Amino acid sequence: GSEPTFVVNASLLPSKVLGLQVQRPQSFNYQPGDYLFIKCPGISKFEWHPFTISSAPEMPDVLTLHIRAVGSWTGKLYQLIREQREEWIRSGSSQSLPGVPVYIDGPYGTPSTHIFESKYAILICAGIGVTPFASILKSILHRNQQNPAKMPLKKVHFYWLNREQKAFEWFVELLSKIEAEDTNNLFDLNLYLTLITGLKSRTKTGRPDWEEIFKDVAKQHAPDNVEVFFCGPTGLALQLRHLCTKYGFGYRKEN
Ligand SMILES: Cc1cc2nc3c(=O)[nH]c(=O)nc-3n(C[C@H](O)[C@H](O)[C@H](O)COP(=O)(O)OP(=O)(O)OC[C@H]3O[C@@H](n4cnc5c(N)ncnc54)[C@H](O)[C@@H]3O)c2cc1C
Numbered sequence: 001g002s003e004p005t006f007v008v009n010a011s012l013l014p015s016k017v018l019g020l021q022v023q024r025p026q027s028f029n030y031q032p033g034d035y036l037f038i039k040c041p042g043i044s045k046f047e048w049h050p051f052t053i054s055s056a057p058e059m060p061d062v063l064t065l066h067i068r069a070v071g072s073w074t075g076k077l078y079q080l081i082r083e084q085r086e087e088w089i090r091s092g093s094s095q096s097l098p099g100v101p102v103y104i105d106g107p108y109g110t111p112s113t114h115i116f117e118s119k120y121a122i123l124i125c126a127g128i129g130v131t132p133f134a135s136i137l138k139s140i141l142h143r144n145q146q147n148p149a150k151m152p153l154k155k156v157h158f159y160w161l162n163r164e165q166k167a168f169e170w171f172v173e174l175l176s177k178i179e180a181e182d183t184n185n186l187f188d189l190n191l192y193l194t195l196i197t198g199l200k201s202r203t204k205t206g207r208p209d210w211e212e213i214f215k216d217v218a219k220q221h222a223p224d225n226v227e228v229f230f231c232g233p234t235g236l237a238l239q240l241r242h243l244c245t246k247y248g249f250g251y252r253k254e255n
């Protein structure tokens, strides 16, 4: 689905991240975990770059993307949006904020959307790899307030690894809101620096002991199936793949 829309707003967030807000076309349906390709003619007339929709589809007028400046195209879009926003602190009030025109193509699925059909799920992510899971956690919130107990999902074990403490700020509010509203203990939140967050859940330190974690989760849910969903580096995916075979957990090869 190709359409000419606009970044109507953006946050600048630690570790050179943009919280893009993009105007959602009337016809654009998506599921949590979906991504799209985005073209920004102001950056490159012809290049398309894929990004997770970090929002949940229950939010009604805007899509969110969280994009980290890691190289040429994201570095440029960061500088464009920083510069347009500076330009406005200095002299902006006259007319409302001008939207960055962008084209979007999607949505495109990942098997992560199957999380809502799983009984027990492990979500492991590194860095901005969190975004698909950000979308899924928000969607799970809306879906308990709306239709309680219509979800086969009984337990979500969440693990989010970060080199820099500041990066947890991207979704500290979401994690807080989940800590407040999860009386029934659907979620097991685990933040690793590779509380410190101001959450009830203490930020842990070092690489997790994945062997001990899988052993414990296997023990909790035997003899039922556990599904592992991963968004992160290949070195970790090799370890996780070996562990999913050892304990009988679902793995999708995505690295
Ligand atoms: C489904 C999907 C979802 C995604 N979701 C997100 C998301 O939500 N948020 C997000 O921030 N990103 C996301 N990404 C990544 C994103 O699509 C961007 O294209 C990419 O992160 C950066 O493009 P770029 O031009 O800025 O970087 P590039 O200039 O392409 O650089 C990319 C990386 O490779 C390195 N590199 C560049 N050139 C070389 C070279 N010659 N040799 C070795 N290494 C090199 C860079 O230093 C950097 O580490 C997603 C990707 C996919 C496939």
Ligand SMILES: O=C1NC(=O)C2(CCN(C(=O)c3cc(-c4ccc(C5CCCCC5)cc4)nc4ccccc34)CC2)N1
Residues within 6 Å of the ligand: 052, 110, 126, 127, 128, 129, 130, 131, 132, 231, 232, 233, 253, 254, 255
């Ligand atoms: O912040 C990070 N720390 C990391 O180690 C990385 C590596 C850069 N990463 C990605 O470029 C990336 C790839 C992917 C990705 C790439 C390919 C796939 C395909 C799916 C269909 C075929 C199988 C793999 C799926 C997901 N998704 C992301 C979602 C949000 C943020 C980043 C990504 C994620 C983890 N990012």
